[PDB]
PDB file of C-alpha atoms and ligand atoms in Angstrom:
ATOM      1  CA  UNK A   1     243.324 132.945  35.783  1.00 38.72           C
ATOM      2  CA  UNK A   2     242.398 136.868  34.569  1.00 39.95           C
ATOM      3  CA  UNK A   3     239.340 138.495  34.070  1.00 44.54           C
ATOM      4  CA  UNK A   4     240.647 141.314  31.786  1.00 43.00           C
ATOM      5  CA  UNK A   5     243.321 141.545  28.773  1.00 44.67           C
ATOM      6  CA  UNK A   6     245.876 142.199  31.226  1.00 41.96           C
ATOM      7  CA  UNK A   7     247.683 140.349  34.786  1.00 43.70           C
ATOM      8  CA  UNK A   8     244.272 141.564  36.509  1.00 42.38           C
ATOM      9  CA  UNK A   9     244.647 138.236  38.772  1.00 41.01           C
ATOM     10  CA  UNK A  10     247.680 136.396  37.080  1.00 41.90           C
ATOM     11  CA  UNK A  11     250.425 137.046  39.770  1.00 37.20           C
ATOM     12  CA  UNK A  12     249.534 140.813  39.736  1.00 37.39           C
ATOM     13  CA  UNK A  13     246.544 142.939  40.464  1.00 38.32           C
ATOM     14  CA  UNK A  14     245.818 146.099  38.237  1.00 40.58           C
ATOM     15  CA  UNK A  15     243.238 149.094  38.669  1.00 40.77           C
ATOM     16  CA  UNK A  16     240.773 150.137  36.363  1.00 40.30           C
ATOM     17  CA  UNK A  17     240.701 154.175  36.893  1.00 42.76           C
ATOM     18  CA  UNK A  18     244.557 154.775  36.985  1.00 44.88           C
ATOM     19  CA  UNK A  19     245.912 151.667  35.546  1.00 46.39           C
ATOM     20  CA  UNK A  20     248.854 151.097  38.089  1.00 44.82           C
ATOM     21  CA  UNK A  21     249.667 147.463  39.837  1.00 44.88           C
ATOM     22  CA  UNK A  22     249.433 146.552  43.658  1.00 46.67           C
ATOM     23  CA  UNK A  23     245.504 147.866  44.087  1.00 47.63           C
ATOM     24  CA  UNK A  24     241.956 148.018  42.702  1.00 47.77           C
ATOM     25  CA  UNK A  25     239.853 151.068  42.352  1.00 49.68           C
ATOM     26  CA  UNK A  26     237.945 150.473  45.402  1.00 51.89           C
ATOM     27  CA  UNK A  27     241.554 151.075  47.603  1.00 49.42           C
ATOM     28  CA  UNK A  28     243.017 153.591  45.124  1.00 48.45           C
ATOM     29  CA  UNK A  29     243.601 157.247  45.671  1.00 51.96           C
ATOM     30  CA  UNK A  30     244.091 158.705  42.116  1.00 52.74           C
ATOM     31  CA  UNK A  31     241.006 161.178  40.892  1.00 54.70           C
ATOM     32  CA  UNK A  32     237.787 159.757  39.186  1.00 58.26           C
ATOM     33  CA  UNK A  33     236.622 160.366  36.131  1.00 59.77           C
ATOM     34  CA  UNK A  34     233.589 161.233  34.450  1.00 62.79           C
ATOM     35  CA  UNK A  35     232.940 158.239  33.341  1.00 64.26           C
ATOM     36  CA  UNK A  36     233.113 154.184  33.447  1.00 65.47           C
ATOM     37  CA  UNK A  37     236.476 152.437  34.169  1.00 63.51           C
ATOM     38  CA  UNK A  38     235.290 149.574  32.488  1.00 63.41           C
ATOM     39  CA  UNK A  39     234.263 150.908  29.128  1.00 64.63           C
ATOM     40  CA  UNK A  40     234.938 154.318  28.801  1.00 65.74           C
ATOM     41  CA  UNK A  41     231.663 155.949  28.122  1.00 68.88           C
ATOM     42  CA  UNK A  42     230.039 158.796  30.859  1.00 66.19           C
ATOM     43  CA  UNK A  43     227.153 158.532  32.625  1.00 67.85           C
ATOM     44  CA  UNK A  44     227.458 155.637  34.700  1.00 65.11           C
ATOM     45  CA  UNK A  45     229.528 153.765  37.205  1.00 67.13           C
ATOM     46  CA  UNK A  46     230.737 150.318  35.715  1.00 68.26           C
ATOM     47  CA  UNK A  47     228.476 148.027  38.361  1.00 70.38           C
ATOM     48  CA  UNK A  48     226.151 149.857  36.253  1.00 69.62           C
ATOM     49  CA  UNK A  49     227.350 148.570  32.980  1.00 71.22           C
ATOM     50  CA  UNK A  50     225.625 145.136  32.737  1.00 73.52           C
ATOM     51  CA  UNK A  51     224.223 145.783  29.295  1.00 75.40           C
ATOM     52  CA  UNK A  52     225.308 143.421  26.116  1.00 74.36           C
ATOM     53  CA  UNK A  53     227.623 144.796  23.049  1.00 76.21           C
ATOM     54  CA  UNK A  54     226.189 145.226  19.357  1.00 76.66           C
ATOM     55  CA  UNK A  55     227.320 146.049  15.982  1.00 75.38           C
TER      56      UNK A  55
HETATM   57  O1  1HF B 101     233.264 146.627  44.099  1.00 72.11           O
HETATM   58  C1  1HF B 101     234.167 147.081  43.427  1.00 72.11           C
HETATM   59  N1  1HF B 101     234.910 146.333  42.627  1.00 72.11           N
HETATM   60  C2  1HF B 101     235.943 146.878  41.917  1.00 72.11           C
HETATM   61  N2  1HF B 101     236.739 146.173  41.192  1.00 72.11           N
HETATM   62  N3  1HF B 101     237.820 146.988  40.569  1.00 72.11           N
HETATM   63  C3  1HF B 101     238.906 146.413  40.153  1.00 72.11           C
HETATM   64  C4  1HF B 101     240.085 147.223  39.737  1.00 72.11           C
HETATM   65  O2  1HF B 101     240.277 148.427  39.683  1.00 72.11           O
HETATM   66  N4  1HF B 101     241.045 146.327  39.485  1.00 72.11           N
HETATM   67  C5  1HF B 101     240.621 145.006  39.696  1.00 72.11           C
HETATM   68  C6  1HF B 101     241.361 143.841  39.608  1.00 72.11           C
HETATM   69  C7  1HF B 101     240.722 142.643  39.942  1.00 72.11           C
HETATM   70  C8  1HF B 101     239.366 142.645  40.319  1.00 72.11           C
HETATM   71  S1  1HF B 101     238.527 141.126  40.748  1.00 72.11           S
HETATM   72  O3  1HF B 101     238.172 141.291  42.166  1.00 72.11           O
HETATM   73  O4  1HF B 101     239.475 140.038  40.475  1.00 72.11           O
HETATM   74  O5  1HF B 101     237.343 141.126  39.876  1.00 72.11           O
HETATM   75  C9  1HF B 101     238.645 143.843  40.397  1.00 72.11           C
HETATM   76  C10 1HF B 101     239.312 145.028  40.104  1.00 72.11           C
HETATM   77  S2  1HF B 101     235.989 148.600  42.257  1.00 72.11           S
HETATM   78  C11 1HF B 101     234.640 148.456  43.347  1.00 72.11           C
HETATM   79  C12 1HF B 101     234.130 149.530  44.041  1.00 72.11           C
HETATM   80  C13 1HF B 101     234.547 150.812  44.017  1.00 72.11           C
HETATM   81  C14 1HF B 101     233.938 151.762  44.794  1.00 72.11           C
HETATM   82  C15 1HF B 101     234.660 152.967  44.552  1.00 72.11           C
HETATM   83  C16 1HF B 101     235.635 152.627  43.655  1.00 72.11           C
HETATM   84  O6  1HF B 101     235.597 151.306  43.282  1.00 72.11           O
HETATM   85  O1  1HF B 102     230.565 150.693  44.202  1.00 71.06           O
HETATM   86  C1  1HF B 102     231.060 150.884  43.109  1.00 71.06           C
HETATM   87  N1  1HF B 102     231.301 152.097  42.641  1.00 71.06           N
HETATM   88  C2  1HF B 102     231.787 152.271  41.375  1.00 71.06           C
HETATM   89  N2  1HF B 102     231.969 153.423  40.838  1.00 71.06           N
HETATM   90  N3  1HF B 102     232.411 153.308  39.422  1.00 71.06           N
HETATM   91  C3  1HF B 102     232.925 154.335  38.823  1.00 71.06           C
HETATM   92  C4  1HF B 102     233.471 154.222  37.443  1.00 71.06           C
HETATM   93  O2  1HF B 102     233.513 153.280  36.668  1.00 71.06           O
HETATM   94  N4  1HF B 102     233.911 155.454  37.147  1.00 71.06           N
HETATM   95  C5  1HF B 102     233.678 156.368  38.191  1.00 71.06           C
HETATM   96  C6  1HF B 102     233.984 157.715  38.252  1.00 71.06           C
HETATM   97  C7  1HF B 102     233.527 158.439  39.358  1.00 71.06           C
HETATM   98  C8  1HF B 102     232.845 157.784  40.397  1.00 71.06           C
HETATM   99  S1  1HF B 102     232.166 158.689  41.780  1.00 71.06           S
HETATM  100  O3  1HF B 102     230.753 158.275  41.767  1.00 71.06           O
HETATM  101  O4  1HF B 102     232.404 160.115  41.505  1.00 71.06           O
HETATM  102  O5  1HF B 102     232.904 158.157  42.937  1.00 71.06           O
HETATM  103  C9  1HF B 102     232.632 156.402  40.354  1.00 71.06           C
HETATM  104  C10 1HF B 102     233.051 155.714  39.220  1.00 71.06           C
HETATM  105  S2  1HF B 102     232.039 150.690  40.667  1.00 71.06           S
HETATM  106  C11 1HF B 102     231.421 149.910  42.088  1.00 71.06           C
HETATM  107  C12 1HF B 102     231.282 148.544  42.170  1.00 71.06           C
HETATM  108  C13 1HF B 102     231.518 147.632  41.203  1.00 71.06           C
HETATM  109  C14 1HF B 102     231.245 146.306  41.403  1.00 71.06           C
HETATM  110  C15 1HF B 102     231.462 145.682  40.136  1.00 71.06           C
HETATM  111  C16 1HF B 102     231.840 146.691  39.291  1.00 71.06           C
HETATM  112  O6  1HF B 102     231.919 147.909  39.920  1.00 71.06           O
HETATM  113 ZN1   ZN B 103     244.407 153.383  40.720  1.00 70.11          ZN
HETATM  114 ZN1   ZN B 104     230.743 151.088  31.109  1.00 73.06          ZN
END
């Protein structure tokens, strides 16, 4: 099982903000941005980012 692209839950576990194994953003220690870990975009913190996609 995974939730993202990558070995999120598959064997390993990933973080969003720094992108290293072992952790999850909640736990890790590396600076935050300003902006979303989960998209990208400023503004907002990714619990936040509940909206759909368009094109
Ligand atoms: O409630 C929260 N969930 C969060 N989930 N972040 C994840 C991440 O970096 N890698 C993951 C790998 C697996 C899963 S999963 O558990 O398998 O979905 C979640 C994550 S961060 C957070 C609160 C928080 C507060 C301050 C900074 O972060
Ligand atoms: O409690 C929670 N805090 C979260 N904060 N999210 C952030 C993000 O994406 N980029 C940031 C950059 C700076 C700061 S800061 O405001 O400067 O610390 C926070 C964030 S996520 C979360 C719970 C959660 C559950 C499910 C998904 O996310
Ligand atoms: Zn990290
Ligand atoms: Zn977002």
């Amino acid at each position: 099982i995974q939730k993202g692209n990558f070995r999120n839950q598959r064997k390993t576990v990933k973080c969003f903000n720094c992108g290293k194994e072992g952790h999850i953003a909640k736990n890790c220690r590396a600076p935050r941005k300003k902006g979303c870990w989960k998209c990208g975009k400023e503004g907002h913190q990714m619990k936040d980012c509940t909206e759909r996609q368009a094109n």
